[PDB]
Design a protein around this ligand. Sequence first.
Ligand SMILES: [Zn+2]
Ligand SMILES: [Zn+2]
Ligand SMILES: [Zn+2]
Ligand SMILES: [Zn+2]
Lengths: 194, 194, 194, 194
Amino acid sequence: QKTYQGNYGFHLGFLQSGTAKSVMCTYSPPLNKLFCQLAKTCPVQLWVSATPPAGSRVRAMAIYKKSQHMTEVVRRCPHHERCSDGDGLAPPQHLIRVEGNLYPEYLEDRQTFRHSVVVPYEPPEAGSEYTTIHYKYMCNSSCMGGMNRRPILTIITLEDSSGNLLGRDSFEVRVCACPGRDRRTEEENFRKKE
Amino acid sequence: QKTYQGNYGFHLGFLQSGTAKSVMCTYSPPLNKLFCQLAKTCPVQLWVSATPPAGSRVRAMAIYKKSQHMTEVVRRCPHHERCSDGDGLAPPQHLIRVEGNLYPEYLEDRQTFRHSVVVPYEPPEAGSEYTTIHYKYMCNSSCMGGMNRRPILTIITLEDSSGNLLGRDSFEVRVCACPGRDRRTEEENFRKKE
Amino acid sequence: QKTYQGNYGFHLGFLQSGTAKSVMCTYSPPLNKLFCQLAKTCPVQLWVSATPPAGSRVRAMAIYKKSQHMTEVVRRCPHHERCSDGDGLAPPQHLIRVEGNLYPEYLEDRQTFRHSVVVPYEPPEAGSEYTTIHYKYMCNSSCMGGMNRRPILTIITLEDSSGNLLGRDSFEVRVCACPGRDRRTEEENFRKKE
Amino acid sequence: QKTYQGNYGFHLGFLQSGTAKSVMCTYSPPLNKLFCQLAKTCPVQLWVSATPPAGSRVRAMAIYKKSQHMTEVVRRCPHHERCSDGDGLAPPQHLIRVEGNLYPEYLEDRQTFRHSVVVPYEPPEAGSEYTTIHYKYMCNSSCMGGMNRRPILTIITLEDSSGNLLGRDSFEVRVCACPGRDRRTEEENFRKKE
DNA sequence: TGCTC
DNA sequence: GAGCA
DNA sequence: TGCTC
DNA sequence: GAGCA
DNA sequence: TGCTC
DNA sequence: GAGCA
DNA sequence: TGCTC
DNA sequence: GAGCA
Ligand SMILES: [Zn+2]
Ligand SMILES: [Zn+2]
Ligand SMILES: [Zn+2]
Ligand SMILES: [Zn+2]
């Protein structure tokens, strides 16, 4: 439910600023919110202080932030669902896609009907303290008939081979045309109270 | 094709300004463009200088203004097509609907596949120089996957009972959230050259 | 072969300047050259001083301007030929497409193998001195493996129902990213001699 | 994945500057990027501090540098793939070719479909600290329908006879018309921050 | 002479 | 449309 | 150029 | 309708 | 960023 | 390699 | 808050 | 990225 590092010290990390990728993907620490452009790869870092057990997996799911929409399943808008921008793996209705993995599992929960994408947990490269997974959002937050300007939260969860929760972290996400511009807007607004 | 008053002096007239209906529907003479809000009734006046022959009809059709999109059929966006805002007569994909008539004909041309709505031609009320038909546009000009910010033209045509063209007139239309504001914008822009 | 107005006073006319369409399509009178962007509709005007005989047609063909390449058939480059930007009528290898006509004939000459597109000749609308046909070029002049920076000429020909030549006119064409910029470049260069 | 010298101290070395070959092939140390011309032989040096086991091989593969294109297989553009500039060994679609070896293996991975070229590992000549392999790139980085201006990375890997990874190094590559000019451009840009 | 901002 | 590619 | 107050 | 999105 | 002189 | 494309 | 220049 | 939408 809430952030939970668990026994493996699991938590998320984000790309450093001033890199050019900032144009299509920029993270705001004070807001713990990611600003990105539709269909652009977003590098998310996975940090663990202990090696997860064999067969551990990483799930990504999107939920609406406000309790007023909490129960509504987050899916692509009717327009993009038909856009035919498929990669041959992600179903057309899924908002979140993983990039760089030829064997992701795209699921729909039998009871909640929520979408999620699962990928095997991979340890960091030699000399690295974290592992990077690339995600892509296939609709803008303002998409009519879709998120329709409702903020969402991306929930990342580390699970063992049997599905048991090992760790969980999350961040807000805004998919828009100008991440840089919009990020500044929400940051100076927030700063107005500091 | 182009404006054609024909033998009956057929042409369109629009609502006078300063009426309150101006908020949801306001016409710009200099631009010969109608600014209106989605699903709001727009009164269009039909003027003839001679009584049309028995069984004459009035057709309304939407086409894209620019030759770059001219051939593309104008239809509602994927979102509104599923909105379930039907009146029980207009098919869900039609942009233009007639209001106030219990027997309109909603058609799709066999060759062009363009939509149109036909209503019997009605003469003016006693002491009136024109007849008023009420139209409604079921998508905003900016609708994604629909008109997607492409300006359109509404073509009104007077035809006899056999479908022969008697007269034809047209006007530009912009379906938006703030007709008044947007109309001012395009008018002062245009005025910049006067 | 060369310009030939014939008995019908046939010749071409081009869009007036200062219209916005100028961004994607602008004609240079001094150069008798059209500057346009790939896949953008270009309005070409057909002028006749006498009504062509019944069943007359209008053909458009592209040839290389320089005698060094004159014999080479003008076709799309290998990349765009596979782009899948078809309209369902124009074969993928044809450079020139007609827009706004549901019944064009796309041909390949049995001996020269040159492409051309034929459309029925249509008279001007009432009160108009010319008829407008919309053409589109599906490759840039600089396309590698295609025109590869070799200037071409578009040949427009008025033919009767039997294929006999009634009239013929032509103009140079440059398909590029910035018609306005490039047109200025070739015009001030040419003006350098005036 | 990342650079890995392994137990044999494997790493790459590049041609010294001021040699004339610099015109068609010049390496930028600060950028660890190679600037070269299409189809020109590029000498790459292989350095090991210990003799690789018998039957060791050297593989070269091209991948896109940005995660946004990471998954896309790097191949020649549609035009050059048909150019018929084959050497009788390298398949027409492969970007990278080895020069000077009559027995190279050109492969396509069964799962990723990525191309690579393998050659037997050869030790340095007597009195030499490194072995030189000659590679050639068969498309420009700007090739339309190909790399289309997307930077790539050439991955060199030392493997034993069974395919096990022994070492791996990499460098960026830009295939262009003027390596010298372009290299200066990216270097003074980078220097602007030093 | 095409592409990014 | 300007600046860079 | 649409949405919240 | 104004201000923000 | 590729091509002509 | 410079200048133009 | 997305799109054109 | 700026200005307009
Ligand atoms: Zn969407
Ligand atoms: Zn709509
Ligand atoms: Zn092309
Ligand atoms: Zn190529």
